[PDB]
Structure 1
Amino acid sequence: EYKLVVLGSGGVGKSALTVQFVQGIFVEKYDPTIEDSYRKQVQCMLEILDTAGTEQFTAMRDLYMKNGQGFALVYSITAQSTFNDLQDLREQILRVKDTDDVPMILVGNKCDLEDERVVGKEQGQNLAFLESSAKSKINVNEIFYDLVRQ
């Protein structure tokens, strides 16, 4: 039994990644109202707690942060804003559960499109680092593999 949490600003790819991992877009219809919606066996069971759609409700992310064990700080590489929003989330994790060390991973989503790129690999590396893509299914599984190891 494991609980991983996906964090980041809106329009980043949190939900796309979440669905792409647990089931996959298009290949099957996605029903987010059933018990197994966010659970995927991998050799152990994982529940993905995603703050997509509920970013405006600060209490929702905190509840997920409490119950979380792994954390994914996702950002778009077409948006300068999203990289700068990560520092705060990093801190807020170390407050709800109240510790010094917490298993997490930085994630750079939307790498497939680079004719709209404004952020570089440079900056993310300076801050675990992956340049993933939810739609192109690049590194989607890898993101959640690193967290169970940690």
Structure 2
Amino acid sequence: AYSFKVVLLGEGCVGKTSLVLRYCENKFNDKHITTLGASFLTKKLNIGGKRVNLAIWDTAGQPIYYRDSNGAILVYDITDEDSFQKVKNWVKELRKMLGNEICLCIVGNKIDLEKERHVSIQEAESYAESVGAKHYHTSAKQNKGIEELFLDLCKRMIET
């Protein structure tokens, strides 16, 4: 019934692979196993009787990849201010290439490290709203908010 392409973008520290690995295999590593290039995995969802097939693309965080993407997940580290500010560049590039068609997610990952938070939740949420994106909080380490993120993204892509 539905087939969607989703790309994860963000800096080297943020947890892109960790989000996908937790969602697809229910595994997590404290080790930073550096992603050397882009690749995709397939995840199947059944929402309202409707079969949704996701092509989830991972990228090396350190145009050809996000071409024809139905959704983009822009990941930052809540303990790293630089990683949040970097999200803004991605939004600009994606909106120039694809317009309002692409469903954007701005994702504050590592919420298990709330004690070490350096990104303003209010700034992040405000920014997300200003660019027509939705903001999400996740922890790949504790498996929090990930099911909700992908489910909501799928709902929004179906509604497009």
TM normalised by structure 2 equals: 0.76
Q: Kindly provide the CA deviation profile for residues 34-84 of structure 1, in whole angstroms up to 9, marking residues without a partner as x.
A: xxx711111211110111xx234xxxxx22210311011111010010111
Aligned to 1:149: 155
Poorly superposed stretches of 4+, deviation over 2 Å: 94-97, 99-102
Aligned to 2:87: 86
Q: How many residue pairs are counted as aligned between the two chains?
A: 133
- How large is the RMSD of aligned CA atoms in angstroms? 1.8
**Gap regions ≥5 residues in structure 2:** 29-39, 47-51, 128-133
- 2:111 match: secondary structure: coil
With over 3 angstroms needed to count, the CA separation of the structure-2 counterparts of 1:101 and 1:41, relative to structure 1, is closer
Could you tell me how far 1:100 is from its partner in structure 2? 4.2
Aligned to 2:113: 113
In the TM superposition, 1:1-150 aligns within 5 A as 1-25=3-27, 38-43=41-46, 44-51=52-59, 54-56=60-62, 62-97=63-98, 99-127=99-127, 128-150=134-156
Aligned to 1:34: none
Percent of pairs with identical residues? 31
Structure with the bigger percentage of strand: 2
